[PDB]
Design a protein around this ligand. Sequence first.
Ligand SMILES: [Cl-]
Ligand SMILES: [Cl-]
Ligand SMILES: [Cl-]
Ligand SMILES: [Cl-]
Ligand SMILES: [Cl-]
Ligand SMILES: [Cl-]
Ligand SMILES: [Cl-]
Ligand SMILES: [Cl-]
Ligand SMILES: [Cl-]
Ligand SMILES: [Cl-]
Ligand SMILES: [Cl-]
Length: 67
Amino acid sequence: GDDVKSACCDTCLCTRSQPPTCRCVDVRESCHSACDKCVCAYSNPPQCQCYDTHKFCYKACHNSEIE
Ligand SMILES: [Cl-]
Ligand SMILES: [Cl-]
Ligand SMILES: [Cl-]
Ligand SMILES: [Cl-]
Ligand SMILES: [Cl-]
Ligand SMILES: [Cl-]
Ligand SMILES: [Cl-]
Ligand SMILES: [Cl-]
Ligand SMILES: [Cl-]
Ligand SMILES: [Cl-]
Ligand SMILES: [Cl-]
């Protein structure tokens, strides 16, 4: 399907390259196992990055009162 809450993301960034490579710059509370390497700053609320690359962009599910 496509209505899946596997990941949400408000800011993807696909690279200028050949072939391309893409990733969600918009960091979250939850880091999903969709990307292989989840790293997290132990902040409050914590921030957490897909270090590992992807070739997809997920729809927006609005995290915090900013975006
Ligand atoms: Cl599904
Ligand atoms: Cl939705
Ligand atoms: Cl350009
Ligand atoms: Cl980054
Ligand atoms: Cl989240
Ligand atoms: Cl998950
Ligand atoms: Cl991802
Ligand atoms: Cl790993
Ligand atoms: Cl610190
Ligand atoms: Cl992938
Ligand atoms: Cl929302």
